[PDB]
């Protein structure tokens, strides 16, 4: 729109306009430094974001999903436009945040926190190993023997259009094991620390999702700080019910931070 175009423009006229470190801003060059090491995990400052334009604190929680998407789109359209040399290897991006003036302990988050901006910590426990999932929907026709084609995918929902090279026909189908896009996976099970309990009873816990960029960093019993966001499996079997819906809650990680972080770590001041 007129205004709904200006989101990406604000990012563009942010990353090379809001400048500190005595000139020659990070996000002028920090993105270059991300492309250099082949990471694709650029991270953003909420502090600096508010120091530029406060506006995108309220325009986030109504759908932080679309905020993050409309950001990383800008990272591509900048990178491959100025670094078309990049356009072989990965050519896909998403960004992170590390400034949220809040720690929500566990046993603190409830129905108001639904599907919006979050922070919390805890302790790791046993979880899964290393697996991928899918990323794109494509099958194979057999009435005409064609491909159904690739189809636009919703987060956990079916598509099934009639349009396809088989005279837009062939309701039935089969599926291949290739020509389709993949995505690593790993899980976590988060517990709360033995210091900040309610002083003597059993503790609480909920589970957390990490994604293909995010695996083989955690371990059982490790130190941590994560933004994450509040999930909802939208149906853990609604019907003629219990005395209670069998619902659950997860957090999906955007930016995980280790609070030990025993590697060579810090950025550089300019001088």
């Amino acid at each position: 729109l007129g205004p709904r175009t200006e989101i990406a423009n604000r990012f563009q006229s942010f990353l090379r306009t809001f400048v500190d470190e005595r000139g020659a801003y990070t996000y002028r060059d920090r993105i270059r430094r991300m492309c250099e090491q082949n990471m694709s995990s650029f991270v953003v400052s909420y502090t600096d974001l508010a120091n530029k334009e406060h506006v995108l604190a309220y325009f986030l929680p109504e759908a932080p999903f679309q905020m993050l998407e409309i950001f990383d789109k800008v990272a591509k359209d900048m990178v491959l436009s100025i670094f078309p040399t990049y356009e072989r290897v990965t050519t896909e991006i998403h960004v992170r945040i590390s400034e949220l003036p809040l720690i929500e302990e566990l046993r603190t988050f409830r129905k108001l926190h639904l599907n919006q901006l979050v922070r919390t910590l805890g302790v790791v426990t046993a979880t899964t190993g290393v697996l991928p999932q899918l990323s794109v929907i494509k099958y194979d026709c057999v009435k005409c023997g064609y491909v159904l084609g690739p189809f636009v995918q919703s987060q956990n929902t079916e598509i099934k259009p009639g349009s396809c090279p088989e005279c837009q026909s062939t309701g039935p189908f089969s599926i291949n094991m290739e020509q389709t896009l993949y995505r690593n996976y790993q899980k976590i099970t988060l517990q709360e620390s033995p210091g900040r309990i309610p002083a003597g009873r059993i503790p609480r816990s909920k589970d957390v999702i990490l994604l293909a960029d995010l695996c083989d960093q955690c371990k059982p019993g490790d130190e941590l700080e994560v933004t994450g966001i509040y999930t909802n499996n939208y149906d853990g079997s609604l019907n003629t019910d219990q005395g209670f819906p069998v619902f659950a809650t997860v957090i999906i990680a955007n930016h995980v931070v280790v609070k030990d972080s025993k590697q060579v770590v810090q950025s550089l001041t300019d001088e």
């Binding site: 250099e36 090491q37 082949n38 670094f83 040399t85 990049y86 072989r88 290897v89």
Partner: protein, 567 residues
């Protein structure tokens, strides 16, 4: 010429191929071929030194009249070297050119291939041996010596007004009856200004050892592709215009291509396996584009490194940034270039040649050749020679010097190749062991200037640096190393020395001389320059090599010799 003299060559001979060199083997195996062709049996030889040579001739105390040595000659009036030579035919073909005149003259037992645009040393014999002062080859007024000796009628003859020749001026006395000696020394010394310009200030190399030999055997109708490659090897050794000069590169682009391209024995049917006739392409002296990944071989050459300074981290940062603009993947930067995928490994040099124009390197690309035997793989221009130098493997068995020579000459066949990969491997491990010392010595600040030069000394023996080729290579990586980054622009131009321990040889503290930066044609003082201190104090020095730039001392008899050799 020997389109006439070669027709002398049928009887017995001895073909000696003087101390280790790539000119040597390439120039000689062809002639071994030639000479078992016209049904001659002959003798090839390893040379361990001028004493090895002299005992060798001693062991061949026959009258083999067609004696042959190649890539040597400037040692003596070698009739003085080789007395029993009476009219024996020798042949010199050396590119160590600053050679004596008594070897040139005496048109008896030598081959004056005197052909050069320098007509500068014509009376160089017409006064040193032809004139003399205060001499005994003369007569006296008494009647007991009333015989005419070898009267040159010059200073070589008497100086007491007895000189029938020397008819330029007066007889009895110019200003005195012995002003003969005065003018003798006038010319003697005023033109030792030019004699000492020869052989006592500087040395160099000249031309090929064996491209002349290619043209020789070309006139007998031989299109031996492999002989083109062997001579290519002989030149690409010291094609290294920084090591020892080619010069003619942009002229041999006409010469050798004209030898080989114009005569196209098959213009339409050559798409075959065996020895599909040689090609030519413009590529690098990047070490070993082919069988290694980038990121190690982008790191051990000096010229790629010194201009971008990688033995510290920051060079790697800018390196990665230029891989960035290149957009090479790091994995791909750590798989062998051939082990890469296709399109990158095709377009690699295609891009690098033009967008390295803009970032601190200009002088990496060259003009050279390459070819297949078959379908195994596509060998490279120099990866023989850098496999060769790794065969100078001075093991303590005492046979391995000459044996490694014999092995090497048995290598460049199309047959023996299981060893050639061996040479590659040995070469690589040494090549990054080179780098392994530079960081240690630079940042330990071992760059001893000690006055008018830079200077190195080392402490114990490495099998790398037992022998001196590796030693010159050490000196010729550090030098650029240090002088890039520790200096202002004033003092980047001074020469270099380097000790070389030999724990093997009871303690001798070997040395090699090497020159300051970026003066290709202005070459070594050290044709003689070290010998100053040899005169001044003088202690157990050697000059055994026909290579000039080398000595061999005691373990510890150098430092005071050096303090004398300050100047």
């Amino acid at each position: 010429l020997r389109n006439d003299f070669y027709r002398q060559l049928v009887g017995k001979r001895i073909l000696i191929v003087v101390n280790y060199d790539i000119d040597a083997i390439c120039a000689s195996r062809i002639l071994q071929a030639l000479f078992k062709y016209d049904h001659m049996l002959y003798t090839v030889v390893p040379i361990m030194g001028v004493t090895g040579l002299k005992r060798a001739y001693g062991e061949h105390q026959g009258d083999v009249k067609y004696v042959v040595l190649v890539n040597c000659g400037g040692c003596v009036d070698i009739v003085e070297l080789l007395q029993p030579s009476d009219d024996v035919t020798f042949f010199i073909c050396d590119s160590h050119r600053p050679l004596d005149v008594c070897n040139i003259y005496s048109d008896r037992q030598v081959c004056i291939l005197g052909d050069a645009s320098l007509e500068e040393n014509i009376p160089a014999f017409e006064t040193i041996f032809y004139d003399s002062e205060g001499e005994d080859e003369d007569e006296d007024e008494s009647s007991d010596t009333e015989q005419q000796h070898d009267d040159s009628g010059a200073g070589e003859s008497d100086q007491e007004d007895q000189a029938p020749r020397s008819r330029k001026l007066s007889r009895l006395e110019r200003h005195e009856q012995r002003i003969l000696k005065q003018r003798a020394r006038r010319q003697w010394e005023s033109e030792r200004d030019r004699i000492m310009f020869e052989y006592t200030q500087f040395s160099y190399y000249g031309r090929s050892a064996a491209l002349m030999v290619f043209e020789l055997a070309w006139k007998l109708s031989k299109d031996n592709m492999d002989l083109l490659w062997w001579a290519i090897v002989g030149i690409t050794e010291q094609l290294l215009l920084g090591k020892i000069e080619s010069g003619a590169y942009t002229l041999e682009l006409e010469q050798i291509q004209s030898h080989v391209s114009r005569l196209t024995n098959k213009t339409n049917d050559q798409n075959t396996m065996s020895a599909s006739k040689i090609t030519f392409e413009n590529d690098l002296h990047l070490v070993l584009y082919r069988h290694w990944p980038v990121t190690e071989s982008m790191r051990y050459s000096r010229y790629s490194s010194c201009q971008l300074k990688l033995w510290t981290l920051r060079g790697e940062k800018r390196l990665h940034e230029l891989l960035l603009e290149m957009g090479l993947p790091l994995v791909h930067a750590r798989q062998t270039y051939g082990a890469m995928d296709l399109v990158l490994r095709k377009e690699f040099f295609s891009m690098v040649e033009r967008l390295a124009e803009k970032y601190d390197i200009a002088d990496i690309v060259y003009g050279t050749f390459t070819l297949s035997y078959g379908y195994r793989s596509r060998y490279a221009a120099a990866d023989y020679v850098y496999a060769l130098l790794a065969i100078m493997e001075s093991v303590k068995k005492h046979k391995t010097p000459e044996d490694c020579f014999l092995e090497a000459s048995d290598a460049l066949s199309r047959q023996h190749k299981q060893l050639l990969s061996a040479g590659i491997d040995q070469a690589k491990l040494l090549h990054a062991a080179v780098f392994r010392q530079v960081q240690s010595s630079l940042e330990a600040r071992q760059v001893h200037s000690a006055g008018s030069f830079f200077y190195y000394v080392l402490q114990e023996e490495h099998a790398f640096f037992s022998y001196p080729y590796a030693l010159g290579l050490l000196a010729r990586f550090l030098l650029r190393g240090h002088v890039a980054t520790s200096r202002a622009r004033q003092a980047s131009d001074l020469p270099l020395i380097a000790s070389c321990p030999l724990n093997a040889s009871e303690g001798m503290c070997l040395l090699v001389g090497i020159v300051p930066v970026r003066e290709d044609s202005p070459r070594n003082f050290f044709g003689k320059a070290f010998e100053q201190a040899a005169q001044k104090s003088g202690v157990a020095l050697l000059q055994d090599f026909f290579e000039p730039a080398v000595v061999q001392l005691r373990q510890s008899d150098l430092t005071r010799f050096l303090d004398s050799l300050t100047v």
